Design a protein around this ligand. Structure first.
Ligand SMILES: Cc1cc2nc3c(=O)[nH]c(=O)nc-3n(C[C@H](O)[C@H](O)[C@H](O)COP(=O)(O)OP(=O)(O)OC[C@H]3O[C@@H](n4cnc5c(N)ncnc54)[C@H](O)[C@@H]3O)c2cc1C
Ligand SMILES: Cc1ccc(-c2ncc(OCC3CCNCC3)cc2-c2ccc(C#N)cc2)cc1
Lengths: 131, 661
């Protein structure tokens, strides 16, 4: 029941009155705590300002153009060979493999897994990925 | 209602009997509830008839003819009530025409020290009751701390000046009798800082409300946090305010640290994000170069070489997707920082300009309490507030002296008679006094009873101005030391022409330091002839007294010339400066509930003193030494009305002793 915007904890009252010089010590202490936080800000602002200058250039010299490829259901000997190497490199990553081949949906790839499981030693290939 | 209003105007509950009524009518309060109402109606109706016309004595015969049935059937009941009210001064008090001329057979002898209002009121009653009453007054005038300066057209009260509402105030009754002229006070009070420019509205209100908040803060601090003792000494209203303020200054700094700590937290997230993007960009840059080299192994290539291009391409657009996500995260972090950088909490709790205007409101409080706030009891300083009268505070335009003078008509007053010694014994009392003009002339006054209205300042004096033989008991002296007797002063400035704002009764001067805050802090227009009063409060009160009149009027004209211009403030035709603490018949202004004291101390003061038996083994003597005055009335100290009531009281008490009830 204090008035609005007044701030009077039983804890703070005892902390200010416990000693003859206590309130000035409480208040000057907070002062010297706010001064050290403000220079911590300054330090981070300048550390950050240095990082932003390294990102000048974005990644735009490095983005490739986004080729779209109409998905096809026919597996070429070429596209099969990509799939093995993709399993060799990426493991169970059905999205990545779909991306590398370019024209095979994620489903077709998981289908490719069991379909050609026996013939391409796809069990052995997945073992080699775990090196 | 009108019958109910009479009770309220008599400071009485209308539907209940009081403790004092219980004492005189214990058959009725312990009796059935019906007779209680009959009693209560008779009491209220008798009060009403008196209140409805206080210029004529309301006799018992008159009261009975005016009651309607069935209330006029128990005439003995009516007679008890009427005599009760008369004795305790609830009816037929102040200045009325008597129907019955006073009986020449006078009974008992009473010496009253002081003809302040308390002394005067008691005297008039005791005379009405048929006793022999003589007043001894040290000054050359009546009125005590009611003291009106008069010179030519100029009239200005150096003492009491305000009627603190008429609703329930006995001075409302008096003013009908004395036809004194009362006037309201316009509440607008422009404050001018020491530079003479005014305080703008935005800030006057911002601070007044902050001041009102800080007060309530101490009361919460007092009642809810039991913060009334600190290092074995009683906490003062001053210390509480200082603690409250420190806590607001603490909380302002707390908010700043919380706010800037939200910024480091966010800046440090940004730091880690940027680090992730810089290491991601370098990893992307390297990868792109690899794809570029693989993409330049011109076909026809075997399938591992085709895998490498398609592989690197995949790896690369994946990392570019990662980077784009991180930079959208960087957008929403960098704007949260623009957010916090644009809502910084309050910079300071109060500025030096602010804290000075705050000091003005403190001085204003120091003024009406007539003491530095460091000396007011935190726990009990506002205790008399539960009994505020209702209605507007008024000033006495024609001079408050009109009252104590009118009261003195017909009384035997010995002016220029300073009491030196009060002797009280089983057989009676001796008051020794001297002529103030020629202290070698000595006077002995023998009396049945002595009523003391010596100011609390005077009782406080060391070494004593008045010696009691035998010495007042410890329980009385210790209350005398405990209580606070304070101090305020005025400077009367009489000009020949009004240069201030006439539609404005008050304006302020803001002191430049906490210490000087009481020094000429308020200027008051209220009289017909062009007169400004200038008030001095707080720690400034005592200090200004050791400064010459001419310097004080200098400081005044200096402040005024700063406000209205040098070209517009003429020299005063006449000036007066009160110095109430140095006045030897006052020794200060009025009482205040000092820290370490309470309102119970005010009661102790009113307790009469009973001497011990002359001969040993002799029956219990009756009380001989009685006490009135503003320091003797718990619920209404430090006022004229409180003094008046206190005198009414003692007169009733003395008459009950020496005439029988
Ligand atoms: C500056 C000032 C302003 C005030 N303004 C207001 C106001 O606006 N409203 C309000 O309600 N109250 C006000 N008061 C308070 C009010 O005036 C007093 O409470 C009251 O009037 C005092 O009356 P009293 O009869 O108790 O004592 P006093 O009037 O002080 O009377 C005591 C008498 O005893 C005399 N005396 C002292 N020593 C001796 C001695 N040794 N021998 C003989 N006689 C002696 C004194 O000279 C005096 O006449 C003010 C007080 C002061 C000081
Ligand atoms: C403009 C203005 C108007 C009124 C008051 C005021 N209000 C209320 C008062 O209550 C009496 C107090 C007695 C001590 N316990 C608290 C109540 C007194 C005073 C007062 C009035 C005049 C003088 C003088 N000279 C001194 C004080 C002040 C300024």
């Amino acid at each position: 029941k204090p008035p609005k915007g007044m701030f009077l904890s039983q804890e703070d009252v005892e902390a200010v009155s416990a000693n003859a010089t206590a309130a000035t010590t409480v208040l000057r202490q907070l002062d010297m705590e706010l001064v050290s936080v403000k220079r911590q800000i300054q330090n981070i602002k300048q550390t950050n300002s240095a990082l932003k200058e390294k990102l000048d250039g974005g990644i735009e010299p490095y983005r490739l153009p986004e080729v779209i490829q109409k998905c096809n259901a026919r597996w070429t000997t070429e596209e099969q060979l990509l799939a093995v190497q993709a399993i060799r490199k990426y493991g169970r990553d059905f999205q990545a493999i779909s991306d590398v081949i370019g024209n095979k949906s994620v489903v077709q790839v998981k289908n490719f897994f069991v379909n050609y499981r026996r013939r391409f030693n796809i069990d052995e290939v997945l073992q080699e990925w775990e090196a | 209602s009108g019958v109910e209003g009479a009770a309220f105007q008599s400071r009485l509950p209308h539907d209940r009997m009081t403790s004092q009524e219980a004492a005189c009518f214990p058959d009725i309060i312990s009796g059935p509830q019906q007779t209680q109402k009959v009693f209560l109606f008779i009491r209220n109706r008798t009060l009403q008839l008196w209140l409805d016309n206080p210029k004529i004595q309301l006799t018992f015969e008159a009261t009975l003819q005016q009651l309607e049935a069935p209330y006029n059937s128990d005439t003995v009941l009516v007679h008890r009530v009427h005599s009760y009210l008369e004795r305790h001064g609830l009816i037929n008090f102040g200045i009325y025409k008597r129907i019955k001329p006073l009986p020449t057979k006078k009974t008992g002898k009473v010496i009253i020290i002081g003809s302040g209002v308390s002394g005067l009121a008691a005297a008039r009653q005791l005379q009405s009751f048929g006793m022999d009453v003589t007043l001894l007054e040290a000054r050359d005038r009546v009125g005590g701390r009611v003291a009106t300066f008069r010179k030519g057209n100029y009239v200005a009260d150096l003492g009491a000046m305000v009627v603190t509402g008429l609703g329930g105030n006995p001075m409302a009754v008096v003013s009908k009798q004395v036809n004194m002229e009362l006037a309201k006070i316009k509440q607008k009070c422009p404050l001018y800082e020491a530079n003479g420019q005014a305080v703008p509205k935005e800030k006057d209100e911002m601070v007044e409300q902050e001041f009102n908040r800080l007060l309530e803060a101490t009361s919460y601090l007092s009642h809810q946090l039991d913060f009334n003792v600190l290092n074995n000494k009683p906490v003062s209203l001053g210390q509480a305010l200082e603690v409250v303020i420190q806590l607001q200054e603490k909380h302002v700094k707390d908010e700043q640290i919380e706010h800037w700590k939200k910024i480091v937290k966010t800046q440090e997230e940004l730091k880690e994000l940027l680090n992730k993007m810089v290491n991601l960009k370098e990893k992307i840059k390297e990868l792109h170069q690899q794809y570029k080299e693989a993409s330049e192994v011109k076909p026809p290539r075997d399938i591992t070489a085709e895998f490498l291009v398609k592989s690197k391409h995949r790896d690369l657009t994946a990392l570019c997707k990662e980077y784009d996500e991180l930079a959208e995260t960087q957008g929403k972090l960098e704007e949260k920082l623009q957010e916090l950088e644009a809502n910084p909490p309050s910079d300071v709790y109060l500025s030096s300009r602010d804290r000075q205007i705050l000091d003005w409101h403190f001085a204003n409080l120091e003024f009406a309490n007539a003491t530095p706030l460091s000396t007011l009891s935190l726990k009990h300083w506002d205790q008399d507030d539960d009994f505020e009268f209702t209605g507007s505070h008024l000033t006495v335009r024609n001079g408050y002296s009109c009252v104590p003078v009118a009261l003195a008509e017909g009384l035997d007053i010995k002016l220029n008679t300073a009491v030196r010694q009060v002797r009280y014994t089983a057989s009676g009392c001796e008051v020794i006094a001297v002529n103030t003009r020629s202290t070698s002339q000595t006077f002995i006054y023998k009396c049945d009873a002595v009523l003391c209205t010596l100011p609390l300042g005077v009782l406080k004096q060391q070494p004593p101005a008045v010696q009691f033989v035998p010495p007042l008991p410890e329980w009385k002296t210790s209350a005398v030391q405990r209580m606070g007797f304070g101090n305020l002063n005025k400077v009367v400035l009489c000009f020949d022409r009004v240069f201030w704002d006439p539609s404005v009764n008050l304006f302020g001067h803001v002191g430049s330091t906490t210490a000087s805050r009481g020094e000429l802090f308020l200027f008051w227009n209220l009289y017909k002839a062009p007169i400004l009063l200038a008030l001095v409060a707080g720690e400034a009160a005592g200090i200004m007294e050791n400064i010459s009149d001419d310097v004080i009027v200098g400081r005044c004209l200096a402040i005024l010339k700063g406000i209205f211009g040098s070209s517009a403030v003429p020299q005063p035709k006449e000036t007066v400066v009160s110095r109430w603490r140095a006045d030897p018949w006052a020794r200060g202004s009025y009482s205040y509930v000092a820290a370490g004291s309470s309102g119970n101390d005010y009661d102790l003061m009113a307790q009469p003193i009973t001497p011990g038996p002359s001969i040993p083994g002799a029956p219990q003597p009756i009380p001989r030494l009685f006490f009135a005055g503003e320091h003797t009335i718990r619920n209404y100290p430090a006022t004229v009305h409180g003094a008046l009531l206190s005198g009414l009281r003692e007169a009733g008490r003395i008459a009950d002793q020496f005439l029988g009830a």
